[PDB]
Amino acid sequence: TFLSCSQYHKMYRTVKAITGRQIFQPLHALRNAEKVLLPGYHPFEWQPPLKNVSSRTDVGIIDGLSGLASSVDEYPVDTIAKRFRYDSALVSALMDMEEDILEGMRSQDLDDYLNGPFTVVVKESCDGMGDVSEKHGSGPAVPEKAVRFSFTVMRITIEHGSQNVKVFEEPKPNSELCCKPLCLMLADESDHETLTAILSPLIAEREAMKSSELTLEMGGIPRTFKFIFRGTGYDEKLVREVEGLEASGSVYICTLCDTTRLEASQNLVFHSITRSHAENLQRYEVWRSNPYHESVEELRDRVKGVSAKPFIETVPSIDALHCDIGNAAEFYKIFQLEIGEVYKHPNASKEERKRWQATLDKHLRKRMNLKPIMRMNGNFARKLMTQETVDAVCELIPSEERHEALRELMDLYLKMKPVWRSSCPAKECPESLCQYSFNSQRFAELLSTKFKYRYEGKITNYFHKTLAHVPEIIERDGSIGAWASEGNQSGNKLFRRFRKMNARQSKCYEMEDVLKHHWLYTSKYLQKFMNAHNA
Amino acid sequence: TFLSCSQYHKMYRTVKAITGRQIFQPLHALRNAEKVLLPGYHPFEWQPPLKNVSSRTDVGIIDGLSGLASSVDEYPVDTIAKRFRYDSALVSALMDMEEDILEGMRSQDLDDYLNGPFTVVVKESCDGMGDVSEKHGSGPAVPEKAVRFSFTVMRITIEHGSQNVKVFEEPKPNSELCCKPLCLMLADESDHETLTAILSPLIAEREAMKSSELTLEMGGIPRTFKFIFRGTGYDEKLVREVEGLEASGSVYICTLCDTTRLEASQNLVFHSITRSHAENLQRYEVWRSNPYHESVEELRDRVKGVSAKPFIETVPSIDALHCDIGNAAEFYKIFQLEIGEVYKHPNASKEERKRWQATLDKHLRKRMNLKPIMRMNGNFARKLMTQETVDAVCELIPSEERHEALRELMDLYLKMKPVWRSSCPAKECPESLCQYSFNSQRFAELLSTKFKYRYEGKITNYFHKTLAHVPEIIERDGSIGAWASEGNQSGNKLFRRFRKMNARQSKCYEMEDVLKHHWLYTSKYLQKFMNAHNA
DNA sequence: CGGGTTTTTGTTAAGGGCTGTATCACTGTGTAAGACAGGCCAGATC
DNA sequence: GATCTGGCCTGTCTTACACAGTGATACAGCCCTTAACAAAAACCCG
DNA sequence: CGGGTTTTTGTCTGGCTTCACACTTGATTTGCATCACTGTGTAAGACAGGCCAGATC
DNA sequence: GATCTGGCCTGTCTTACACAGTGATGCAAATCAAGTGTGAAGCCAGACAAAAACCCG
Ligand SMILES: [Ca+2]
Ligand SMILES: [Ca+2]
Ligand SMILES: [Ca+2]
Ligand SMILES: [Ca+2]
Ligand SMILES: [Zn+2]
Ligand SMILES: [Zn+2]
C-alpha cells in the first residue's frame, strides 16, 4: 500500500491505543523480519567454485560502479548505480518460492525428500526509462534518464526417472510484479562507455555461473540447481546496439537473418534464423583484421553489417509489445494514405497529407470516440485494430476494390495476431498456429500486388519479422509473447512512485531504498498474503 | 494517513481474510459516517432570519461561481471555484466540538444544562499559494495559481452570572490542523475582478450574520450562539490590495496609520492606529466624488493614498511570520553591507557587492555551516539571528567599533522579538513586555545615530511596524502570534498532496474532493482519536 | 478523634531485553510587478 | 540657436513566491527477580 | 525378551449449562463491476536525390 | 570553356521515447430481524477398570 514509515507508525499506535490489543507489529520487529527477504541472508555453496566471484554469503546492496576509479585524471564518470550480486539475488529468488516448488512436486506426484538437480530457466530484460526527473521546489526540471536491469524466474523443472518433469511455471509471465530488479543506474542507453562499465561485472557473473552447481538447504534436505539463462526482454534498439549490429535504419534489417532491406521486398517469407552470438564475435574479428584487404564497401558487404564487438549475449527473438505497436502505426499510415487515394495520383505536397491526417482524426473520433494521439498506446493499438474501424473508414474510400482490400487486410491481420499474442499458443490457439504459414503467405501476396505503390522497395522490418520468423521461433521456443519486455516496462510507474514516496534524498542511498522496496514488492512469499481473500 | 479509496480496500480485505474477524469497516459504512461530519447535516435556525440568505439546511458543496452567467457574449471567465455556505460551515464547526466545549463548561464549574448567549470569536484569513501545477506532459513553462479562503474558531465564551468565562480556547491557533477551509479557487491572487466575483457572496453572508442569533441544540437542550469575526490572517499584499490602498511601493507605508516613510523615519515612535475600514470607505468616496475641485497631486495626499473601493472589512494588525522573515533578511543585508565597511568609503559599485555577498556566504558556510539560499525560509531566519553567527561575522569584519555596533544591536533585537513571537505573551513573558518601551527606543536611537548612513531617508515597512505599533496592538487585541497566518500558509503543502492522491480528474470534481478531504483532515472530532496514545 | 486492623502502597535498591520518540544527514531557485528617482535628451519656445 | 522640459530610460527598492519528509540510528524509560523497611488511606469499637 | 510399574485413558449414571438446527419472509450490509475523466512531438541515425563549386579534361 | 564529381543540404523513413488510477454509482448476492421447540452436546462428579511408556527380573 506504498505507505511511508511514520504513517505506518501512526496507524499502528492509534490502533493499539483504541482497541487495546496489538494487531500490528512495531517497526524494529519489521526490519528484523524484512532482513529475511533481501539477498545475502541464506547460506549457499557453489560447486565447483565460481571463477572471479567472491565466496562470501553476506553481499546485499553493492555499488554499481564496481570500484571504478573516478578521479580528475581518468575518464570522468558521474553516474549512480546500485546492484545485487547475481548469485545471492538468485538464491533469494529460490528461497522466496520454496513453498511453490514443493507444492508443485507434490501435485506432480513426486517425493518431497528429493534433491535432484533441478534446472531453472530465467528470462532477462533491460529497457531504458528516460525522463524520470521531477521539478523540485518551484521551477523547471532536467531531462535525466535511467536504466534498470532485471530478470525473471520463469520455468523450474527436474529430470525425474528418464525424462524431465515440469515442477513450476509462471502463471502470468510478463506481469508487472514478477520481474525482479537486479541493478539500476542513472545513465543513458546510448552512452556506450558508462553502460558497458556498469554491465560488465553482471555479464561476467552471468557467464561464470553457467558451468556450476548451486547447493542450499531447501526446507530440510539440501538441494542442487543448474541454470539456463535466455536474455529476451531486449527491445529492437538495444538488441541492435549491444549485440554488435549497426544503427536502426540500416540496409540490413532483421536481427535474426541477414538480408538487405531491398531483398526482403522481393522474396518475403522463406528465410531462416541464422545469427548466433559467437558468429557475431568472429565476424567482428574479421572486420577488425580485414585479412582479404577489401575496401570498406565490400568489407561491410561481407560481414553483413556487424561493425562492433558484441558486448553481451542475447538470443534472437521478437519483442511482441513493440512489434504490435509498430504494426498498428503501419496500418495507421496506410489508412492516412488511403484517404489520400494516392494509388491513382501520386506524390502530392506536404499539405494534402496533413489534411488527410486531420480529416481521418476528426472522422474516427466522431464515429468511434477515439481522441487523437501520436505516441501510440498499446491500448490505442488494440482500439484501432478493430474491424469496426475498417468499416467506418471504408466510406471515405470510393471504390469496392479498396473496400475488399482493406477488409482482407484487417481480417488476415486479426487471424494472425493471436499466435504471437497469446502466452502459450501451443494449446490455447492451435488453429491459427497450424494456419499461420498459409495465412501469412497469402497476406504477403496481396500486400505485394494490391499495394505495390508503397511496398515495392522499403518494407518496414517488423513486417518481415511477423512474416518469416514467427513459425520458426514457435517451433524453437514454445511461446512468443511470454518472452516480452512488457513484463518490465510496466515497472516505470513503480520506480517513480517509490522514488517519490520512499527515499532519503541523498542521490547515494536514494537508490538503495528504491531497489530494496522494488525487491520486496516483487516477492512471492510476500504476495501469498495479499492474495488471501481467495478461500 | 493520506490513503486512497482502493489501497484502504486492499488493507481491509487482507486483514479481514487473515485474522477472520474484521477490524476495519467497509467503504460504504465509512461514507455513511463521513456524511455526519461534512457541513449541511443538522437542523439550525436563525433569529431573526438572515436577510438574503436561504433558509434550507441541506446545502453541501456549492459551486463557488455563484451562478455567474458565462456566455461568450459576456466577460470570459474560466476559473474553477468551490465553497460551502458560511452558516452551514459554522454550524458543523461548532457541532463537532460540542464535546470539547461541554468538557470546558464542566471544568469551569458550570451547570452543564446551560443555554446562555454563547459568543464565538472567529479569525479569518486568506493567502494565494501559486505554482500548484505539474508538467505531466513533461512540457515546461505553464504556471497556475490558486487561492484558499479559510477561517478558524479561536474562543468560545459565555456570560455566566456577572462576567464571562472561557468555555473554550484554542491550544495552538496558527497551526495547520485547526484552520478550516471555506472556499477555494484557481485564479491569480491579483486577478482583481475574478477575486471579487468569487469572494463577494462570502462577505454577503458574513455581513448578514452579524446582527442575529443561531439557535441549535447542543448536546440535548438547545443553545444560542452569536459571533464576532476578526479578519487578520492577511499577508501584506492582500491587505494592501483588497482594503484599497496604493501598492507596497507607495510613499504611504503603514496599513494602520497615515504617515509617509520620509516622516516616520524622523518622528520615530509616537504613532497610533487611525486607519479603520469605514473611514477607508468614506475616504474612497471623497476621492471618487472630488468635492473640493482640487488637483490630483494634492487630492492623493488628502485621501492618504486610497484609490479603490475596499470590499472586505478587515482589522489591521502586524503579521508575524512575514515580519520576522523581513527583519531577518533586513539585517542580513546590513551584514553584507558591513563587510564592505561602506561607512568609511561610500558609493561602491555593483561588483564589490557581489564579492561581499560571496565572501559572507562562504565564511558562514565554513563557520556555522549555514547553507546558501536565495529565498530565505523561516528556518534560515531563526538560524541567522544568533549571537554565534554575528560573532563569526564580527570576527571576519576588520574594524572594532562595528563589534559593539552590531552585537549590541542584535541582542536588543533578540530581547525584543519574543513579545510578538509568542502565542500568549500577555502572561508568558510579562517582563519584556513592560520593558518594550526602552528595549525598542534604544534600538531606534542607535539606528538613528550609529547607522544613520542608511536610515536617514527610506525606512522599510516592517521596521516601522515593529517600532511603532505592537506595544499598542497587544493591549488592543491580546496575542500577536495567535493572530497570524502561519496556519493557513502551512496548509499549502497538503493541497498538492490531496490533489494527486484524491481526485476524479474532471477539473470540476478535482476541487470538490480536495475541499472535502481538507475539511475532514482539519476536524477535531477526528484528531481526538489520533491523540489516543497520549491520553 | 484513635490503636490496631483492612486490605493494601511506596520505594527503592541492586542490572537487562523490549518500545517509543528524538535526532541525523540531506536535499529543492532567482523572481514578478510597481513606485519613485534621477540622468539624458531631442524637440518646444522666445 | 540657447534653455527648458516631459518623455523615456534606466535604475534602484519593496513585497511576495519552496525545507518538510524519509529511512536509519540512538538513546531513555519500563516491565522483568527478591525483599525488607517503611508507608498508607479506610475503618471499627474505643 | 518379559513381568510388573508409571503417565495418563475408556466408561459408570446423571444433573445443570450453552449451542445449533430448523423453517419464517423481507430489511439490510457487503462485494464486485463499471463510469467519466485526464497526459505532450519525436530524437538519434541511415540513406537518397539534387544543387553546384569546383576539380578534371 | 565543357563536363563529371564530391561535398552540402535538405528531405524521407526506421526504431524509439507517457494512461492506470481516482472517487462515485449501481446491481446482485449473502446476512440478520426477531420469531418458537426440540436435539445434542458438553461439563465431567470420583470410580472402576484397562492402554501405552518405564524399574525389577
Ligand atoms: Ca527501449
Ligand atoms: Ca520502454
Ligand atoms: Ca501571500
Ligand atoms: Ca503564502
Ligand atoms: Zn528477418
Ligand atoms: Zn504605522
Curated annotation (Swiss-Prot), chains A, B:
Effect of mutating residue 87 to A: Loss of DNA-binding
Effect annotated for changing residue 462 to A/L/F: Capable of nicking but defective for hairpinning
Cofactor section: Mg(2+); Mn(2+)
Reported impact of residue 246 to Q: Impaired cleavage
Summary of subunit composition and partner proteins: Homodimer. Component of the RAG complex composed of core components RAG1 and RAG2, and associated component HMGB1 or HMGB2. Interacts with DCAF1, leading to recruitment of the CUL4A-RBX1-DDB1-DCAF1/VPRBP complex to ubiquitinate proteins and limit error-prone repair during V(D)J recombination.
Tissue expr: Maturing lymphoid cells and central nervous system.
Signal peptide range in chain numbering: none
Residues of the full protein shown: 474 to 1008 of 1040
Annotated protein name in UniProt: V(D)J recombination-activating protein 1
Positions that bind a divalent metal cation: 127, 235, 489
Highest taxon in the source lineage: Eukaryota
Traits of the deletion mutant: Mice display a severe combined immunodeficiency phenotype. The have a small lymphoid organs that do not contain mature B and T-lymphocytes. The arrest of B- and T-cell differentiation occurs at an early stage and correlates with the inability to perform V(D)J recombination. The frequency of homologous immunoglobulin pairing is much lower. No obvious neuroanatomical or behavioral abnormalities have been observed.
Main function: Catalytic component of the RAG complex, a multiprotein complex that mediates the DNA cleavage phase during V(D)J recombination. V(D)J recombination assembles a diverse repertoire of immunoglobulin and T-cell receptor genes in developing B and T-lymphocytes through rearrangement of different V (variable), in some cases D (diversity), and J (joining) gene segments. In the RAG complex, RAG1 mediates the DNA-binding to the conserved recombination signal sequences (RSS) and catalyzes the DNA cleavage activities by introducing a double-strand break between the RSS and the adjacent coding segment.
GO biological process, one term: regulation of T cell differentiation
Gene Ontology MF, one: ubiquitin protein ligase activity
Effect caused by changing residue 252 to A: Deficient in both nicking and hairpin formation
Reactions catalysed: S-ubiquitinyl-[E2 ubiquitin-conjugating enzyme]-L-cysteine + [acceptor protein]-L-lysine = [E2 ubiquitin-conjugating enzyme]-L-cysteine + N(6)-ubiquitinyl-[acceptor protein]-L-lysine
Recorded family membership: Belongs to the RAG1 family.
Consequence of substituting residue 236 to A: Impaired cleavage (defective in hairpin formation)
Effect seen on changing residue 124 to Q: Impaired cleavage
Effect of residue 499 to A: Capable of nicking but defective for hairpinning
Substitution effect: residue 319 to N: Impaired cleavage
